[PDB]
Amino acid sequence: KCVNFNFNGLTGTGVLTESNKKFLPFQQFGRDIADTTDAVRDPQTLEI
Amino acid sequence: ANQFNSAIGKIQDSLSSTASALGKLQDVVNQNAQALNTLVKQLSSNFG
């Protein structure tokens, strides 16, 4: 669903889709070539 | 008959080995891709 997505670091809007992208254990979020965050790790559980 | 057929066969070897012959059409995509990518990068700037 398309709603506001805020995980602990920023407020944003998008749609969550499970993908194969992986983050470092201490890593929170990452950005695309456009300098915009395409994914954020769950602050509670472990998922990308 | 041998001259016309041999000239067409050289086209397949020219486009496969030399990729710079099509660079005229590659610049059209590059000028459009660099213009869109740079236009996005200005959103992160504070502009004073």
CA pair distance A40, A4, nearest whole angstrom? 13
Integer-rounded Cα Rg, in Å, for chain B is 20
The pair of three-digit structure tokens given for residue B17, joined into one six-digit string: 């080995």
SS3 B21: helix
Asked if A39 contacts A48 with a C-beta cutoff of 8 angstroms, the reply is yes
To what resolution in angstroms was this structure determined? 3.6
Asked if A18 contacts A11 with a C-beta cutoff of 8 angstroms, the reply is no
CA atoms within 13 Å, Cβ hemisphere of A24: 4
**Chain B residues bordering chain A (beta-carbon distance below 8 Å):** 37, 40-41, 43-44
Method: cryo-EM
Find the length of chain A: 48
Whether chain B has a CB inside 8 Å of the CB on A32: the answer is: no
**How many helices (H) and strands (E) are present in chain A, helices listed first?**
0, 4
